[PDB]
From Swiss-Prot:
TM region positions: none
Family annotation (Pfam families): TusA (PF01206)
SUPFAM superfamilies, per database record: SirA-like (SSF64307)
Organism in which the protein naturally occurs: Thermotoga maritima (strain ATCC 43589 / DSM 3109 / JCM 10099 / NBRC 100826 / MSB8)
InterPro entries per UniProt: TusA-like, TusA-like_sf
Protein name: Putative sulfur carrier protein TM_0983
Superkingdom of source: Bacteria
Active-site positions on this chain: C36 (cysteine persulfide intermediate)
UniProt family annotation: Belongs to the sulfur carrier protein TusA family.
Length: 98
């Protein structure tokens, strides 16, 4: 994947924070060019089995947070940390299980 050696990436506090902020994200959920109904059951596990202080990403053409709200609100409220856009119907959302 991305792990090959020791952690020597984000060592010192670099102020080179470009457009995209280097937040403490854990996983990323991408449902762009989907095929089989596998990705569907995937997101289901996200809300069905949310972890305490988890942080996930969302890259699609629709706000998945729609179902996220009912879940996080059942316990706390919402996993809202960041929201942005990219193109016409393609947007990017940031979610974080508190």
């Amino acid at each position: 994947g991305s792990s090959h050696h020791h952690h020597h990436h984000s060592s010192g506090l670099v102020p080179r924070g470009s457009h995209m902020a280097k937040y403490q994200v854990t996983k990323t959920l991408d449902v762009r060019g989907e095929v089989c109904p596998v990705p569907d059951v995937e997101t289901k596990r996200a809300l069905q089995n949310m972890k305490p202080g988890e942080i996930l990403e969302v890259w699609i053409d629709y706000p998945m947070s729609k179902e996220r709200i009912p879940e996080t609100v059942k316990k706390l409220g919402h996993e809202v940390l960041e929201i942005e856009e990219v193109g016409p119907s393609e947007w990017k959302i940031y979610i974080k299980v508190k």
